[PDB]
């Protein structure tokens, strides 16, 4: 198999840069249209991270920052598969995640919300997907939180995530929400996404058969990245 | 077929997950950073620095930047590189940094990349691929950094020549300076307005 | 107005005593049918509690047990009206509430769930309704929790409540859930209720206009008790 | 018209909200309890005690009980009492207790109530209204406690006579005992099985 | 009752500032997003106007400018209630109105439309709402009129109105239309409103039971302003 | 719950209903105007004047402006003021004016307001709340006017400090001038473009 | 992969023990609720049976009991896959089957139905599933039969089956029916199953492409057993 | 995800498929039976016997029973056993039998199992897992058999201690007897009524 370029990003499946309902995008979006280029080796390559450097608790947000007890909050496992748009598994991709604690408070110098800080919770983790594209991490479910867009804006609970995979063109940062959160229908950041089916692609689903008795609930969330086409005739990449 | 998962802004707290040390969280032993130069790394060491400005001309004090580049011989440290050449074994090719919360300055310590093959037998001028994530930015913005001391190579670069508004090509050229022994390339990014930096859909 | 008896409890609007899906009801339900009686002064009277005895923080579960900081969790206000079945307001009724903390852990000697205890949260409060039948309290939203019925049983988040109002016949204890919780469709205790419309009568609704910016969300939950009929002819109560 | 909010079990942790001191929570200054006798309360002091048993004959060690009763002259301390008589001013008429976690025993300190008017000019025998809440019990179970030393009044009681299975009437009569000076009425409740206690829909 | 801030204005229920179909908005709309602030005493207070200053004909547009006869046109009464978003009546609010005459001609130096001026009609009135939030005025129904947006633009008949009530935050100016006017479906100014249900909130309804025989028709039009939340815990307004 | 009635532009003839005298209509005996100073009004008299400019830098010659402010002691003449202080009894606190049809100039005669409490025990710097209505403007635009001679108080003002783009804060400060005895504050409003005035959603 | 416990049996997907329409269940069902336990090595292990012991005709009910001719009846092949609830194949599981002959008569001392016995048919077989979870056996289609529940009760044709697989917790005995049998809608034993979709999970489907010309028809029937969850954090099984 | 195939009663003729020799069918050369002891099997030989009774106290004469147990060292002969210990190589750990058609008696010849690890580092007391299938039984009923001569180990057993109604724990203890040299454990199962045997959902 000789790989060709990644399929073009479908701009209609993502939010636009300029989205006036999310106020800070007004001064942080370009006025010019993006310039599309034909891909080169630069766009189809990406770095490799070795599992050797990762700690044993890097994907366990319940224990990785715990000092003298456990963090307060709802114990949950999140797992799923990362695939490319042609359904192929994405192997050894770097998944980094971050989130607020159970109060909706982020452990960050710029977050001064009154929601209480939890001395035993940090809110960040990472892991590499396996050969089947599978990933799993454990954490405390985050609480929704208020932020200033309109004065009484509130975001539904969410976990932020980032992926660095096989090609630089696949680079993506997004966030997923939890099935049934009533704030999903009100969020201006989620509403920057044009279509209802793509807004639904960010909702993690309750996975009841995988709950662990007297311990933790479980949510299922799959991620899809751009995929490469195979070449059978001229290969102009180089 | 499946649709790509849609992008969402990294938000103002992106540091927690990607640069925890900047958010004062010590939880990892190995932390990803902005230093791409290892002791045995080959090539000329350079510093890349600048600021990212918004539409009012103010710097973004919460932006996160990553860069991806080839080694000194223009080979990428990725299995997807098909040149059949040996890559520098002491080079990750990637780094990540965050703008300083008070000044908005960002920098990387890296090496100047060698030229990489372009499509259909062409040669690209030396460049570094860069992406920007921040509150207010819904999808990471991709751009490239070229070097002003490679005018000859830049004039023949396929991607720069593919920008039909020629006056905009200069927004992608960083300026070389020499701060007492060290080579520094200053690359300011202007997201909106006059001299707006070219962004690509790659 | 001369008051007569309370209208009969509609048994079809409540769970049955024997409900095999809730295992502990099998040995704790009578085998004989209840004996219905005609009401007397005993059934139409009830005690009166004075507001004088109540503390200033008795309806503030965020602060009433706080010692050296705030409890961890989602800040929420719950409010609503207590009415009788004929729509009349229920005035000066005693509403007592209790719940688990943000981890789904109850502050009780018999709860040993691994969900973490929160040193600044107690989980109980009380208040009297006002002349319009209105009540309001503030708390941390409780987390769902596992319990042993089937081995992997989980209850959706809920706040337990009790009301002592005007007549002993109105005595009621129940619990309300939060709009959108996906566990509501799975709970065997909620499923002891026969009808879908009554299961829905226990769901508190998101009240977005009453959220307090950069502070707390708000849920609306009304309660309906049995009501007395008025008498215009013979009054046989006495 | 509106339907009554449906009942749900109080559950095993009902103590947190209704008897916090039993769950070792000190948060209220005034706590509701099982002592209905104040220093100036009129009437003869009595102790009411017993256990609640399940279908295997084992006691419920997590049950919560409340009682509601008239004062010594048979007047209720409620605005809904229409007798036009003055009620004892130092009497709440209600109390709440929980069975002991290890033995299942429960008790109340109260006074023996006077007779209360029944419907259509009748007189009810002295009684205390009692309700039971616990894990496994979906709707509080209502019953009444009558006194074995009031046989004459019990034989004419409207509610007891309304139970057509006469052998069951005796499950509602508590037994008088005198523990060195104190009068005690023992009332065991059997939720299911032989000698099952009569429960009412009131 | 201790009042807290007004609920946040729901921007999705109003037109956007920039609406290219209404041409003059292109240069008169800010490019920056509005900055939302937390309310202070400045935003929750407003002036009080005394009924003493008002003339007896200030709410009677048929007679308040009449000199030697009555104005020509359709005699109509308009009445309704002003409430806040929580349904509470808005008492003693200043309602000012203005409109074109029966020809669609405004009595203004800058209106040069050929529709004839009516010497006995002025086109402005005012009144204060009563304790129930009720208001009533009488006028001549205005005629629709052409204006230059596109060259052949026509607006349906409408009466402009302004309200100054209890809080500066409630300040509002809008206009209402008349049930059945076919131009309602074509107006670019009405189409700046996003949703169909809000466009319908500006339509006054025929109120046949309140027509006055051999005299005047009647239209019903209610107005809803922003409402204040009550506070039961911390009061940070001051 | 009900939704707020949607806003619509006041249009070019807004004068008919709100400033009839400017449209040459005499129908009211008492006309609301731009003079907030009564003979017994307390405080220092000041004149507030300026123009409103559109995106081409041209003045709006049909704009209508209103202002709302506290008295000299920082008390609002409104029942909603909870300071428990006596307000100046000869002060409405509000006025309305229209830009001149030929020049676009507008002005008010008022007094300089005293400082008003902010949230959570803070103190706001002296300011006047202002709203703009006009053809082309779909919803009245809210802004505030602060005074350049109150630099100390402005530097600590909660609302000004809540604008994160600091360079924009200056668009809200009017400039003091003294036209032979009279104190005048010039406040020009720029709806769009460079130095665009900050507008609030209140 | 470290295996954790089997997912909990969903009691709502099976018949209840007490089902009065199936008369013999009235005295053979416990009165107490089952006690759910957390699984140990005892519940997740099971015996292994070697294929070496099985005869060549153990899965051929047409020939395994044939003495001097073939059994009378409809020649059919039944095949399918055994999977766990997460879709994984169940390998080397013991499947044992039994059934009546073509007359609806069982070869058992306690069956005295007048339907004729067939000297060349026994009615029992067994096989182990292969690595893909596949099984196949051949037999004579059984006839429906009368039995005494109500006096004229009749069961649709069915083949009884039993599975011993990887864990004792998966132990299951059931029976499957044949597509289109009109008695399926009347059987009290099939009606003990609560839901229509689970009643349908017992119907074997006609598999026309797999019929063997001039020989035998074919039915397809898949079986699903409980599945184990994988563990990625604490493993408390031991 | 898929739902488990629903259970159905094994019915009165379950012997045909699972114990053909009891239904007088000789079709298999190797027949599964109730003898778990092979000549080289390690451990003490014991006989397990009893009857299964219905709600009228009558024995089930058509019930089929299977048992599953560890070897003498408490290791299961299953690949799912994770103890890392060698299991007795001459032990299947499972057997099946049917009650006699006339008396309802059933028995197994097996060995007494060793203790098996419980969860979280605990130790379970010696036990045999048993399941019952029969006409009238819609889903096989699971129970456990413990031994009365292991009182010390039974008192600490996690599963027995997880039954909160303590009086029911004794229904799971079989009684040791010694029929001239042979050790026999009698375990009667009562499906319904008084002393009903505990059944588990495993
Ligand atoms: Fe976030
Ligand atoms: Fe609960
Ligand atoms: Fe108009
Ligand atoms: Fe059968």
Short mmCIF file of C-alpha atoms in Angstrom, two decimals, chain B residues 5-153:
data_model
loop_
_atom_site.label_atom_id
_atom_site.label_comp_id
_atom_site.label_asym_id
_atom_site.label_seq_id
_atom_site.Cartn_x
_atom_site.Cartn_y
_atom_site.Cartn_z
CA UNK B 5 -15.10 14.71 15.04
CA UNK B 6 -15.81 18.48 15.08
CA UNK B 7 -13.31 20.91 16.55
CA UNK B 8 -13.99 23.08 19.60
CA UNK B 9 -11.87 25.83 21.12
CA UNK B 10 -9.12 24.68 23.51
CA UNK B 11 -10.37 27.44 25.85
CA UNK B 12 -8.42 29.55 28.40
CA UNK B 13 -7.42 26.57 30.55
CA UNK B 14 -5.83 24.49 27.81
CA UNK B 15 -2.59 24.63 29.90
CA UNK B 16 -3.94 22.17 32.40
CA UNK B 17 -3.96 19.37 29.88
CA UNK B 18 -1.13 20.34 27.57
CA UNK B 19 1.40 22.40 29.67
CA UNK B 20 0.52 21.49 33.28
CA UNK B 21 3.71 23.04 34.66
CA UNK B 22 2.44 26.43 33.36
CA UNK B 23 -0.77 25.93 35.34
CA UNK B 24 1.33 24.87 38.38
CA UNK B 25 0.37 21.25 38.35
CA UNK B 26 3.13 18.70 38.93
CA UNK B 27 1.70 15.35 38.07
CA UNK B 28 3.87 13.98 35.25
CA UNK B 29 7.54 13.02 35.54
CA UNK B 30 8.14 13.59 31.80
CA UNK B 31 6.67 16.88 30.59
CA UNK B 32 6.39 17.84 26.89
CA UNK B 33 8.02 21.23 26.29
CA UNK B 34 9.46 23.78 23.86
CA UNK B 35 13.05 22.50 23.69
CA UNK B 36 13.69 20.41 20.60
CA UNK B 37 17.53 20.46 20.99
CA UNK B 38 19.09 17.47 22.72
CA UNK B 39 22.83 17.32 23.47
CA UNK B 40 23.61 15.19 20.40
CA UNK B 41 21.10 16.90 18.06
CA UNK B 42 22.64 17.90 14.74
CA UNK B 43 22.31 21.32 13.07
CA UNK B 44 22.43 24.96 13.82
CA UNK B 45 20.66 25.94 16.99
CA UNK B 46 18.20 28.79 16.60
CA UNK B 47 15.60 30.41 18.81
CA UNK B 48 12.13 31.09 17.39
CA UNK B 49 10.11 33.76 19.24
CA UNK B 50 7.25 36.19 18.83
CA UNK B 51 3.78 37.21 19.97
CA UNK B 52 0.27 36.48 18.61
CA UNK B 53 -1.96 39.56 18.24
CA UNK B 54 -5.75 39.86 18.04
CA UNK B 55 -7.86 42.20 15.99
CA UNK B 56 -7.27 45.18 18.37
CA UNK B 57 -3.49 44.61 18.07
CA UNK B 58 -3.26 43.23 21.59
CA UNK B 59 -1.35 40.08 22.34
CA UNK B 60 -3.07 36.82 23.20
CA UNK B 61 -1.88 35.98 26.68
CA UNK B 62 -3.47 32.55 26.73
CA UNK B 63 -2.42 31.08 23.35
CA UNK B 64 -0.73 27.67 23.03
CA UNK B 65 1.62 26.98 20.09
CA UNK B 66 3.12 23.79 18.66
CA UNK B 67 5.58 23.37 15.85
CA UNK B 68 6.50 20.37 13.66
CA UNK B 69 9.63 20.35 11.51
CA UNK B 70 12.26 18.17 9.81
CA UNK B 71 15.81 17.63 11.01
CA UNK B 72 18.86 19.39 9.64
CA UNK B 73 18.91 17.19 6.51
CA UNK B 74 15.24 17.74 5.83
CA UNK B 75 14.07 14.32 7.03
CA UNK B 76 11.03 14.02 9.36
CA UNK B 77 11.28 11.85 12.48
CA UNK B 78 8.06 10.01 11.50
CA UNK B 79 7.37 6.59 10.03
CA UNK B 80 5.35 8.40 7.36
CA UNK B 81 8.52 9.97 5.93
CA UNK B 82 9.24 8.09 2.72
CA UNK B 83 12.59 9.55 1.77
CA UNK B 84 14.50 6.37 2.65
CA UNK B 85 17.03 8.57 4.45
CA UNK B 86 18.22 8.21 8.01
CA UNK B 87 16.78 10.85 10.32
CA UNK B 88 18.78 12.48 13.17
CA UNK B 89 18.17 9.93 16.00
CA UNK B 90 18.25 12.61 18.71
CA UNK B 91 15.41 14.79 17.42
CA UNK B 92 11.69 14.70 18.18
CA UNK B 93 10.81 17.36 15.51
CA UNK B 94 7.96 18.70 17.69
CA UNK B 95 7.54 21.01 20.63
CA UNK B 96 4.81 22.94 22.44
CA UNK B 97 4.82 26.20 24.34
CA UNK B 98 2.51 28.75 25.84
CA UNK B 99 2.62 32.52 25.68
CA UNK B 100 3.65 34.13 28.95
CA UNK B 101 0.55 35.20 30.93
CA UNK B 102 1.74 38.75 31.45
CA UNK B 103 3.64 39.59 28.23
CA UNK B 104 2.28 37.18 25.64
CA UNK B 105 5.82 36.29 24.47
CA UNK B 106 6.42 32.69 23.34
CA UNK B 107 9.62 30.93 22.18
CA UNK B 108 11.11 27.61 21.12
CA UNK B 109 14.72 26.35 21.12
CA UNK B 110 15.17 24.28 18.02
CA UNK B 111 17.44 23.84 15.00
CA UNK B 112 17.09 25.32 11.53
CA UNK B 113 15.48 22.69 9.28
CA UNK B 114 16.90 21.44 6.02
CA UNK B 115 14.90 21.56 2.81
CA UNK B 116 12.19 18.92 2.29
CA UNK B 117 10.99 17.46 -1.04
CA UNK B 118 7.78 19.03 -2.36
CA UNK B 119 5.31 17.40 -4.72
CA UNK B 120 6.18 16.19 -8.21
CA UNK B 121 9.93 16.42 -7.76
CA UNK B 122 10.04 19.99 -6.43
CA UNK B 123 12.00 21.22 -3.38
CA UNK B 124 10.39 23.17 -0.61
CA UNK B 125 12.27 26.01 1.09
CA UNK B 126 13.20 25.39 4.78
CA UNK B 127 10.12 25.89 7.00
CA UNK B 128 8.51 24.99 10.30
CA UNK B 129 4.79 24.08 10.45
CA UNK B 130 3.03 25.90 13.32
CA UNK B 131 -0.43 25.66 14.89
CA UNK B 132 -2.18 28.00 17.30
CA UNK B 133 -4.89 27.06 19.87
CA UNK B 134 -6.63 29.47 22.27
CA UNK B 135 -9.84 30.71 23.81
CA UNK B 136 -11.86 32.30 21.00
CA UNK B 137 -10.25 30.10 18.32
CA UNK B 138 -12.63 27.35 17.26
CA UNK B 139 -10.25 25.32 15.13
CA UNK B 140 -6.44 25.37 15.48
CA UNK B 141 -4.95 27.81 12.94
CA UNK B 142 -2.16 26.34 10.78
CA UNK B 143 0.62 28.50 9.34
CA UNK B 144 4.27 28.09 8.26
CA UNK B 145 7.43 29.93 9.25
CA UNK B 146 10.05 30.53 6.50
CA UNK B 147 13.42 32.24 7.01
CA UNK B 148 14.42 35.61 5.58
CA UNK B 149 17.99 34.44 4.94
CA UNK B 150 16.71 31.81 2.48
CA UNK B 151 15.41 34.28 -0.12
CA UNK B 152 16.55 32.17 -3.04
CA UNK B 153 14.83 29.05 -1.73
#
